[PDB]
Amino acid sequence: MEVTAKLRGAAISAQKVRLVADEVRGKSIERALDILTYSNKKGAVFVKKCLNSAIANAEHNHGLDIDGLKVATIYVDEGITLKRILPRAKGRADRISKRTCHITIKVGE
């Protein structure tokens, strides 16, 4: 089986979290946690939180051995965008997209 965690609504662009996700996809839980704890990217704190939640789900709700677990699948999806107005010169306005993202992690043997 595959155990899931979801981190819907992280205040960050999915394009940014995707670089973090690409490096932990398919790795063992230990190696992936190392990569996430020593990354300098903001998206790594979100990916690490979601991965830790998925590991705890697999250990508590399903009684799996987290020693044989691995990041079976991970992907980031776009969340809801907050729309803000940015004033510019000469009385002109721009729209600002404050993008959010959904992180889905599934761990399994």
Place this chain on the structure above:
RNA sequence: UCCAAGGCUAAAUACUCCUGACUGACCGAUAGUGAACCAGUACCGUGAGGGAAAGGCGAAAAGAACCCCUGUGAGGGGAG
């Protein structure tokens, strides 16, 4: 053919801010009132004035006790 320089006179005619009953080969949320929603509101304008967007869990809240990750967060996974 009819008697101005005195006055009057109902009905059949015009209408709908409204009340009641009833109707529709009228609309069904970008439609139909601008407005189904705390709308002539928010917002814009010194002002006269202009003028939006925005409905729906389920039959019944039975709206998820409790456990786990997390920062007593967000979010989720179980349980129900």
